[PDB]
Structure formats: C-alpha cells, structure tokens
Design a protein around this ligand. Structure first.
Ligand SMILES: O=C1CCCC/C=C/CCNC(=O)c2c(O)cc(O)c(Cl)c2C1
Ligand SMILES: O=C1CCCC/C=C/CCNC(=O)c2c(O)cc(O)c(Cl)c2C1
Lengths: 214, 214
C-alpha cells in the first residue's frame, strides 16, 4: 500500500516542538489525556447506538485496553469507540487548526502545568511528552482501517492498513516510547498513573501483561 | 484477498474425524504438541541462522507465546520459529499424506492414549481435540505472510494475509475453542498443563494475561 503525505497545520507543528522541547515535568498526564480521548470515543459510539444498534455489532464490547510491548519499546492504548475515517484522521490529527492551540502555547510559555493541555482541546499531542514516533490506527464503521503516522516532523502519512490486527471498530494509539520513558511499559507504574488521574471512567480499563512461565 | 481452496488428503480427513469424534480424555496434550512444534520451528531458524545471521533480523527474539482471547473464545499459540511458505502450508498441513497417519489411526482404534499422537508425526491434528476451527498464520523469511484455515471439513483455504498483525517471522496457531473447552483460556489451567507436559523447553514460554485495572 502506497502512503500519502500531508503537512501539519503550522501552529500544530509549533505546538509539537514546544511539547517535545520545553516540558520537563508531569509527563505522566499523557496517559490521562489518551484515556479521556478513548472514553470520549466510547461515549460517541454508545450514544450513536442510542438510536441505532447495528453500530455495536462490529465490536460489541466497550473497553479501553493498554498493552506494553517491551521488545519494541512500544505502548499501545486501544479503545472500541466510534473510530475515525480516513478524512477524519487527516482533519482531526494535523491539517486543521485547533482553536485552543495558540492559547495553550501561550499558557505553557507563561508557566502553565502541561496538565492544562486538555482544557485547550489539544491533549492528543501530550503523547509527544513520552514518544518520538506515533502510529494512530483507526477503524470507523464508515470506512476501512487506516494508519496515521508521525515522528513530530512537519508532515504525517496516512496509509490504508494491510499490516496490523483487525480492530472491529475503534482506535489504537501506538506510541514508540523514548529511551528515558520506558517506565510506562511497567505494570506497576501504569497502574499508579491510572489510579492518580483516571479514577472516574465508565468503561473497563484492561491492562495486558506478558509473563514468562517458570 | 481472494481465498484458494484445497482438499485434504483422504487419510487426514479420516484422522481429523477420528480425533474429533472418538477421543474423550487427555485432551490437554494438544498444548504439549503445539509447544513441541513451536520449539521444533525455533530449533530450525536457530540452526539455519548459524550460516546466515541475517535470518534472525526479521525477529531477533526466540520465544513461544500463548495468548487467550476470551471475548472471541480464541487461544493463540505463537512462536518466532522458521515459519512456513505458502507451498509449505499447503503441503505440510493437508495435501500430502503423512507417513504415520494410518498407523496412528489404527493405534488409536486399538485403545492407544491420544498422547501417542506425537510419536506418529501428526500431533498438529490434536488441536481438534479442543477446537472446531483453526487458522494457521505463518511468515517465513522466504515468503509473504499467509493464512491457512480449516473447520475440520474436507477442504481448507489458504489466503494472502492482509488482516492480522505482522509477525516478523514464525507461526501462530489461532484456535477457535469449542464451548466445553474454554478452561484453556484460563491462566491457572494453562500453567498447569505446561508444568505437567512441557517441563523441558529451551525457549521462554510467555503467557499474555489481560486484567481489568480495578
Ligand atoms: O481524539 C481524537 C481526535 C478527534 C477529536 C474528536 C473525537 C472523535 C471520536 C473518535 N475519536 C478517536 O478515534 C480517538 C480515540 O478513540 C483515542 C485517541 O487517543 C484519539 Cl487521539 C482519538 C482521536
Ligand atoms: O509443524 C508444522 C507442520 C510442518 C512440520 C515440519 C515443521 C516445519 C518448520 C516450521 N514449523 C511451523 O511453522 C509450525 C509451528 O511453528 C508451530 C506449529 O504448531 C506448527 Cl503445526 C507448525 C507447522
């Protein structure tokens, strides 16, 4: 499958650099932001099923699932929410201006805790606090499975997915963690962050742990 | 991808029917057989890498990995062994007569424990003790990733894989468990069976467990 390349909207490119280069503390809130986004997407498929039930048939179970993949230095956060079409990935994750982007960059430069990022609608980008590369794999009932990929350059790619597991419906954030942020692969640390920041979630949060049989 | 359909060699169809219909006890040995096959495949890539270290670069870690997927009533057994090309899947898993097939069917009808199946070189088919459907997903350094699928009919399908996760190299047995054999989804049962039958394995056996964060 041939990939397509897109340029980030200018302020998003600026936001990404500010996040990667000027934020030193409270990185762990990336997980809160990603859990919140997942919860949001789960709400929308659930609501959209409030007046149409066939929607859930692609993935009847509603969940958030976190999967450390230590060998690849990867952390995946999956949900069975409403998902994103190809156009939605392109529009929502880079090409269109987010209204709060500038205000957030100003706030941050003024000394704001990065925890404030969600208040501005750009919490997705907090993932760059811990990862230097990300693939967003998404399946909406309304489209085929796609892969959005960024390395915090100035452009991203979108590719029809012929390489990852089928998700019936929903989104996977595949974070390629930085070498100094591998603590987020660890069961105990993941649990701690969830308990501190994601106490009130309406959906099961599953953690996938791989143990050697001795 | 369009599927290709192939007929099973006659005695294999017979073997499958006998396994599914006449074996009542010691079903758990299916796991020993599948673990042994995985170990075998891991031996072969390891040996072959002796004269071609680039062989491992597709998947540097040598492991066996067991993943229960309760939602789907599925149990996966994965290894990063040498894998099978498209022709190998077709030849090894259905079209070619296995020399011990007849002798095993006779032994079984004479009262032999099914545990003896490995002795006749047909241990793969023990999976039908617990599953009514199986997909074998395989990736050899020498070919593309393929899916072999059977429901113990008289025919199987082989399909170029554009729907599952990329394995770097190796084989996944995806067992669709029968409703009275779901005990093999449970961490405790799996550990028990490994401890009894697969005490001596040269490769780490990893078990992937999914737990809700409470
Ligand atoms: O928030 C996102 C940008 C669009 C904002 C509006 C939400 C749309 C509903 C579907 N949202 C999603 O797939 C989704 C998700 O499930 C988990 C996530 O970590 C992220 Cl980043 C997203 C995408
Ligand atoms: O044993 C198999 C039939 C061919 C016998 C000779 C083995 C060839 C080397 C590659 N073997 C495999 O991919 C393999 C595996 O990794 C795990 C398994 O459960 C099974 Cl059934 C197989 C295939």
């Amino acid at each position: 499958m041939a990939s397509e390349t897109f340029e980030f909207q200018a302020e998003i490119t600026q936001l990404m650099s500010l996040i990667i280069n000027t934020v030193y503390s409270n990185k762990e809130i990336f997980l809160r932001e990603l859990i919140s986004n997942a919860s949001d997407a789960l709400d929308k498929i659930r609501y959209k099923s409030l007046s149409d039930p066939k929607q859930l048939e692609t993935e009847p179970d509603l969940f958030i699932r976190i999967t450390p993949k230590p060998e690849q230095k990867v952390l995946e956060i999956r949900d069975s929410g409403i998902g994103m079409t190809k156009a939605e990935l392109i529009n929502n994750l880079g090409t269109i201006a987010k209204s709060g982007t500038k205000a957030f960059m100003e706030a941050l430069s003024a000394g704001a805790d990065v925890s404030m990022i969600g208040q501005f609608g750009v919490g997705f980008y907090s993932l760059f606090l811990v990862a230097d590369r990300v693939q967003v794999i998404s399946k909406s009932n309304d489209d085929e499975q796609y892969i959005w990929e960024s390395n915090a350059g100035g452009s991203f790619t979108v590719t029809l997915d012929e390489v990852n597991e089928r998700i019936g419906r929903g989104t996977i954030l595949r974070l390629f963690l930085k070498d100094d942020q591998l603590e987020y692969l660890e069961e105990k640390r993941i649990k701690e962050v969830i308990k501190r920041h994601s106490e009130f979630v309406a959906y099961p949060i599953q953690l996938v742990v791989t143990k050697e049989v001795e």
